[PDB]
Structure 1
Amino acid sequence: APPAVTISASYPGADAKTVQDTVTQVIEQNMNGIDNLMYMSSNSDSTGTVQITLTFESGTDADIAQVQVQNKLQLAMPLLPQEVQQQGVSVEKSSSSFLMVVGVINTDGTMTQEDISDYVAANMKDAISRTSGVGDVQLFGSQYAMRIWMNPNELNKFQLTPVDVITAIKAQNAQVAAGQLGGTPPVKGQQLNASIIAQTRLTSTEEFGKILLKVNQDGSRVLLRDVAKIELGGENYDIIAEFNGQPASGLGIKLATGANALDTAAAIRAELAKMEPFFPSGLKIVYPYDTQGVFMTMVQLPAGATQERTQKVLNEVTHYYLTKEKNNVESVFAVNGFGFAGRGQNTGIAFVSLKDWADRPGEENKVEAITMRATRAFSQIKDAMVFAFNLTGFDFELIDQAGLGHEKLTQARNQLLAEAAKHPDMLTSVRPNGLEDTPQFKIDIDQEKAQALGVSINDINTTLGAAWGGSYVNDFIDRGRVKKVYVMSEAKYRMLPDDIGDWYVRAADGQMVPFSAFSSSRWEYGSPRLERYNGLPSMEILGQAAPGKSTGEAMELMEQLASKLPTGVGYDWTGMSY
């Protein structure tokens, strides 16, 4: 297989265009002087994430490819936003499919899904990630952060903003280098040498709660707990898993390019066996997907679907396997928010593990017939592509060659797809691989009114982004492990457009100004997932030869249709069609 190197980065609270224009394009412009690179592609998403896939010529040494990528990225790191650099960028050389899933449950039901995910992140994931052969590890859940959930009514009451909260956290959750008594070079005759210990990272919600924001006129104190709820909770809340219907977390493990699948799998099991004796009571490892025996079910809803509707589709899939197929299925490990195409509110995946082969007699009880029955059973679920499969037509890229812009490229794509639909004798299921535009809330800050009132643009933008998007402030120590601190609005103050107006910013004169005084808003459409191909805006299109036609004939037609598109739109073949 041509080896592929993946770059992943994240920007908390960024939309797709922000990610693309401050991260993705910057990295892509700096991926020069790297040997044997066949093509590059990227996705920049509304989850605040980017993934750039560099695919190398067959026979390239994947170690050298990865090293060259890492080094060019290192030289491009200073060009990226600090918010991105501080999350960690990763660069992996792995297969795109899972080798195995390690599931974790609590059999006594005494730990929640969120607790289980933190346990796995904090105690299991890093040792697995260092195991030789392990190329990529996806946590099905999130590690805890210290979550400061801000209340805008209380902030306004005390004439404070998220800027004041961030500043205080940085000052009062600090790890200070303070030198030594009797330190070198010392005076003659010194008898005592000792470290000076000053501030240290906070370790508990109680300590964060007592951070001192201000002292009032009369000397009453405003504590962080007076303007916020303080709790451990996920760095994000995007991925939730279940195992046979019960709360779960786990690790999805991808094999490093060229590593041995059996040897890697055995090293992983040996590492889990070291951890098991120290698990808290009730915790238990399950094995829902070891690469017959197993298959997956993809769940892909249209862009704009909620966590709640994705969950409802996964519950239907899970229910089908645990009732209709209960004689053939041992387990289902279902993940809401992650799918075949990675992270998103509208995607899920279910890993299905079959009972022993010997206890599934009959052609009708083998993986092929089971997946085909399941796909049929799921083919009438509304507004969701749901199919059951195991880990070829064509793979086409439409390309913006002339600075046309997303809206024109979408029009050209739709023209091509309309034309393809008029040749059902040659082409079948000609579709986009990505996502459609959805409604977004466009807010314009009025620079004149802000200046007139003495409100800083930096205070406005920090207030908006920290409250509605979340902001990683600094680190703290949870049970001996370094973890992140996040400030964000409590949920109830960031749900609806009128909530925008309950956020106040402090002007240079000390007056509190509501967001409504200096902003206006409207609905518009934009992309939740912007694609690029060899450094240019792109839209991927899949499809196949109609029955009794060759792949070549269908490709030739696609090219003929593509030659009649608006000026400045090109194309290229990729993946299986390269």
Structure 2
Amino acid sequence: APPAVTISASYPGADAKTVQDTVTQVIEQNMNGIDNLMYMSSNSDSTTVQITLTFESGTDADIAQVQVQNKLQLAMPLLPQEVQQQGVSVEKSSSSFLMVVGVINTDGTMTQEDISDYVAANMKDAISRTSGVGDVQLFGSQYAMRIWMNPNELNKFQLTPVDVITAIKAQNAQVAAGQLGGTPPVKGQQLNASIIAQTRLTSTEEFGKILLKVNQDGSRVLLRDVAKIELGGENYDIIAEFNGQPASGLGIKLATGANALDTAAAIRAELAKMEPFFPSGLKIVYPYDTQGVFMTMVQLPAGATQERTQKVLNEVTHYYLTKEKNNVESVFAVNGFGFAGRGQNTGIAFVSLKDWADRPGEENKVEAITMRATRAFSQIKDAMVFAFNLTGFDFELIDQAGLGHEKLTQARNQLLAEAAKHPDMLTSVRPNGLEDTPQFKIDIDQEKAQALGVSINDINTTLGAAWGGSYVNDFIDRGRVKKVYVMSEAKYRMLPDDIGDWYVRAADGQMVPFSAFSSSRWEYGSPRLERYNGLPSMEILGQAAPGKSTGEAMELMEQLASKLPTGVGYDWTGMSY
């Protein structure tokens, strides 16, 4: 292969464009003076950023990573504060999984939510430090302290999310307080002792009794009086299942250049060290090990919910657990994660067959099963459901003259239209990315905000803390460091009319609803902005028509492209380079 280093970063609550223009563009503009870089591609979602730098075949993957990490270190201070705190990762690894380590609870004592935190808090790190382990993907989230804010109760006592956050930073602190008898000391000093002031909080109990304010009569407004307080995931996006029951697990990619077999064993040895100390019921299951396994991918059209993707994964699981009983030992299925990317609209299912010896006949081998499966799932509505083991072409349409996303889409659509008019050379020329979707656009009226004495900082923190969530600081949960997140309780951040129930305090102490200084409309925007070598782009996949070769099909695509609007370019990547 040609080695690929992958930068990954995150911005809680940001949209694709925000991500792209505050993170993606900034990293890319500084990825230079790096040896042997063939090309660079990137994604910015309405979740998160992936920049993939692909190097010349023969390149020393170590150096590529070091050089890359070093340029990212020099761009770090240009990125937003919110992004840096999440911590960017830079990884040299294959983009396929070596294996998946499933975790279930046979006694049913622990939910999906509880299991994933077990894995995050007790297993992931050790596996992550095992040699050969390039990337580790948790199928779930680690617990954070969740402060679920109520806007009705916040407005009742004239507080905002800004007040909550301020108090969480003041009362969930870890203070350096010096010592008694500390150096340099007076003559004859007999006592030396550490001073311990505030330490991090550890419980919901504790966070709940954070004191927000004293009313003028004397009563106390605590954080439990404007919020529900529970341990809950950092994100809620990824949920998994193992033969239909609640599960978490670890997708483990092999480090570029590592031994696949040795890495597998080392991972197994480290898991053997953990088992003794599991809670009653926890159990490791091994659903995908690389003639024996395959995956099944699920793409719903963008704008789809988690609930609807779960419906499709259930039919997928159901087919393997019922119609293919005698061949399938197990199905590990994940809502919210996809072979390429993340998001509420995708999903994947890892399938593990029974012993080769108990599946006699060419119709029960992996090729026949996957084919039957895909035939079976083609009868599913508004979902691309494709099951496959582990060559046509790979084309990037590039914005070469500042045209814009709206314009590059029309040029993409015009190229797709033309390619459809040659069934004899090109079949299923599809775009690899996603379509624009209804997004809620809200304008802050700066005049009214000023007239009323309402800070824009207090407005956008209120908007953003409530509807997107905000990582405030760290806390210790059973002795491990973890995040604290302030966000609105689900029910006050679901519908447009809820915008108007959030109040912001003015300079004169009066509460002002968002309604007063905001206005909103629907519009369309991208949920996944693509870039190829620094410029906006759109990846198009296709294959050569039957009894016609790659080169001829490519030659046609190249001709079709010359007739696109001024400033639209192209390039070949991946298999086509």
TM range (shorter): over 0.9
SS at match of 1:219: coil
SS at match of 1:92: strand
CA deviations 1:69-125 (Å, max 9, x no partner) are 000000000000000000000000000000000000000011000000000000000
CA deviations 1:415-456 (Å, max 9, x no partner) are 000000000000000000000000000000000000000000
CA deviations 1:127-182 (Å, max 9, x no partner) are 00000000000000000000000000000000000000000000000000000000
Structure 1 regions of 5+ residues with no counterpart?
Answer: none
SS at match of 1:85: helix
Match of 1:69 in 2: 68
How much has 1:339 moved relative to structure 2? 0.5
How much has 1:333 moved relative to structure 2? 0.1
How much has 1:380 moved relative to structure 2? 1.1
Question: Number of residues paired by the alignment?
Answer: 577
SS at match of 2:20: helix
CA deviations 1:373-399 (Å, max 9, x no partner) are 001000110011101111210000000
How much has 1:225 moved relative to structure 2? 0.2
Measured in 2, the distance between the counterparts of 1:164 and 1:133 equals 46
Match of 1:233 in 2: 232
SS at match of 1:86: helix
CA deviations 1:494-532 (Å, max 9, x no partner) are 000000000000000000000000000000000000000
Measured in 1, the distance between the counterparts of 2:343 and 2:222 equals 36
Identity %: 100
Structure 1 consecutive aligned stretches of length 4 or more whose deviation exceeds 4 Å: none
CA deviations 1:456-475 (Å, max 9, x no partner) are 00000000000000000000
Measured in 2, the distance between the counterparts of 1:469 and 1:388 equals 34
SS at match of 2:326: coil
How much has 1:274 moved relative to structure 2? 0.3
Measured in 1, the distance between the counterparts of 2:337 and 2:92 equals 20
Match of 1:15 in 2: 15
How much has 1:358 moved relative to structure 2? 0.2
Measured in 1, the distance between the counterparts of 2:89 and 2:252 equals 15
Measured in 2, the distance between the counterparts of 1:295 and 1:431 equals 24
Measured in 2, the distance between the counterparts of 1:387 and 1:509 equals 60
Match of 1:39 in 2: 39
CA deviations 1:516-563 (Å, max 9, x no partner) are 000000000000000000000000000011000000000000000000
2:477 aligned with 1:485: no
How much has 1:405 moved relative to structure 2? 0.3
CA deviations 1:274-322 (Å, max 9, x no partner) are 0000000000000000011100000011101100110000000000000
Match of 2:463 in 1: 464
Measured in 2, the distance between the counterparts of 1:60 and 1:499 equals 54
CA deviations 1:231-250 (Å, max 9, x no partner) are 00000000000000000000
Match of 2:561 in 1: 562
SS at match of 2:295: strand
Measured in 2, the distance between the counterparts of 1:390 and 1:301 equals 21
How much has 1:332 moved relative to structure 2? 0.2
The 10-residue stretch of structure 1 (93-102 or 384-393) with the greater mean CA deviation from structure 2: 384-393
SS at match of 1:127: helix
Measured in 1, the distance between the counterparts of 2:253 and 2:328 equals 24
Match of 1:24 in 2: 24
- Aligned pairs for 1:80-119 (under 5 A) are 80-119=79-118
CA deviations 1:476-495 (Å, max 9, x no partner) are 00000000000000000000
Measured in 1, the distance between the counterparts of 2:403 and 2:327 equals 52
Measured in 1, the distance between the counterparts of 2:303 and 2:239 equals 18
Measured in 2, the distance between the counterparts of 1:163 and 1:548 equals 65
The 10-residue stretch of structure 1 (187-196 or 339-348) with the greater mean CA deviation from structure 2: 339-348
Measured in 2, the distance between the counterparts of 1:534 and 1:93 equals 19
How much has 1:31 moved relative to structure 2? 0.2
How much has 1:564 moved relative to structure 2? 0.1
Measured in 2, the distance between the counterparts of 1:313 and 1:7 equals 31
How much has 1:342 moved relative to structure 2? 1.9
Match of 1:527 in 2: 526
Measured in 2, the distance between the counterparts of 1:441 and 1:342 equals 23
Measured in 2, the distance between the counterparts of 1:444 and 1:454 equals 17
How much has 1:350 moved relative to structure 2? 0.2
Measured in 1, the distance between the counterparts of 2:324 and 2:25 equals 47
Measured in 1, the distance between the counterparts of 2:131 and 2:388 equals 28
CA deviations 1:42-82 (Å, max 9, x no partner) are 000000x0000000000000000000000000000000000
SS at match of 1:501: helix
Q: What TM-score does the superposition give when structure 1 sets the normalisation length?
A: 1.00
Measured in 2, the distance between the counterparts of 1:186 and 1:292 equals 72
Measured in 1, the distance between the counterparts of 2:542 and 2:409 equals 18
Measured in 1, the distance between the counterparts of 2:388 and 2:95 equals 15
2:550 aligned with 1:551: yes
Measured in 2, the distance between the counterparts of 1:162 and 1:187 equals 47
SS at match of 1:499: helix
Measured in 2, the distance between the counterparts of 1:122 and 1:547 equals 52
SS at match of 2:522: strand
Measured in 1, the distance between the counterparts of 2:355 and 2:318 equals 20
SS at match of 1:51: strand
Structure 2 regions of 5+ residues with no counterpart?
Answer: none
CA deviations 1:327-363 (Å, max 9, x no partner) are 0000000000001112111110000000000000000
Measured in 1, the distance between the counterparts of 2:391 and 2:383 equals 22
Match of 2:161 in 1: 162
SS at match of 2:264: helix
SS at match of 2:86: coil
